[PDB]
Amino acid sequence: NAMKTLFLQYPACSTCQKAKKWLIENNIEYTNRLIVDDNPTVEELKAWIPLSGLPVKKFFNTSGVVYKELKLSSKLPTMTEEEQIALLATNGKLVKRPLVVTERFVLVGFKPEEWEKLK
Amino acid sequence: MKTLFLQYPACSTCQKAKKWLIENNIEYTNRLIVDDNPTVEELKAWIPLSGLPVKKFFNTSGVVYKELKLSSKLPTMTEEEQIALLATNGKLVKRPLVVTERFVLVGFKPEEWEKLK
């Protein structure tokens, strides 16, 4: 069922295309979602981050221009998780992509070694 | 290098960890995590190596953790504040910890300790 795997991406992004190619190659049904047009909300981020097992900074798009001009490189430490999550929910360009969300795990960016948990 | 195995004798998960390292022929050096507690310099290097949030290095069954309501508090604290707290006393740190040059493991999840060859 495609409703059990949520794929959040930005279609012009090069890592996304690769990931999407991998999901189809591997026969994984999923539900598409545009991370920028329909950006993660606080309530989502607050469920997705713990499931990912990763630091909240790992959910930042550090290749982004929006990241760059808000100087988040320097600012992120000085921010609490609450503040970092609140920020993330304000702009989808700020969120790492792609993300895949399932009931048991969340994957951040495209790491084929890790995306195998979906098989 | 040495493989530090930081633990608390009376803890049953550390006991399970130790049992697993011996069973699986992995060479380690025992360290008492309470008596010989992780320093700020150790935490600042170990935390990046584990790939976990700083949050995950807290002993969630310790007395300070519970009495300070550290589950509701920790997200209101910066990484640096969390590390300075963690360094104050060994009973605050999640156990067991295994430390090598390549990586750091926190708590005992048998599948993840596969990295130890």
Q: Where are the alpha helices (DSSP H) in chain B?
A: 12-23, 40-50, 63-67, 70-73, 79-86
Contact A82, B76 (CB under 8 A): yes
Q: Which helix (H) or strand (E) holds B33?
A: none
| Cross-sheet strand order for the sheet of A99-101 | A31-34, A6-9, A99-101, A106-108
First to last CA, chain A: 13
Residue A51, C-beta contacts closer than 8 angstroms, at least 6 positions apart: A101, A104, A105, A106
Inter-axis angle of helices A81-88 and A42-52, nearest 10 = 120
Q: A81 and B52 in contact by Cβ < 8 A?
A: no
Residue B37, classed as helix, strand or coil, is coil
| Domain extent listing, chain B | 2-117
Q: What is the resolution of this structure in A?
A: 2.2
The string of DSSP letters for A96-119 reads -S-EEE-SS-EEES--HHHHGGG-
Q: Does any CB of chain B come closer than 8 Å to the CB of residue A114?
A: no
B78 in contact with chain A, both atoms CB, cutoff 8 A: yes
Q: Could you tell me which CATH number the domain at B2-117 has?
A: 3.40.30.10
Q: Given CA atoms B11, B12, B15, B16 in this order, what sign does their dihedral have? A: negative
- Tell me which amino acid residue A112 is: P
Of B92, B9, B15, B100, nearest in space to B56 by CA = B92
Which chain B residues are closer than 8 Å to A53 by Cβ? 52
CA atoms within 13 A on the CB side of A116: 3
Strands A106-108 and A99-101, bridge-based pairing: antiparallel
Sign of the alpha-carbon torsion through B14, B18, B21, B23: negative
Task: Report the alpha-carbon distance of residue A56 to residue A58 in Å, rounded.
Answer: 5
CATH class of the domain whose range is A1-119: alpha beta
Q: CB of A86 within 8 A of CB of A80?
A: no
- Interface test mutation site (partner A, options B79, B81, B112, max chain A beta carbons within 10 A): B79
Decide if B112 touches A, using CB distance below 8 A.
Answer: no
**Residues B115, A1: Cα–Cα separation, whole Å:** 33
Using CB atoms, pick whichever of A53, A55, A80 lies closest to residue B77: A80
Comparing C-alpha atoms, which of A104, A105, A79, A112 is closest to residue A94?
A79
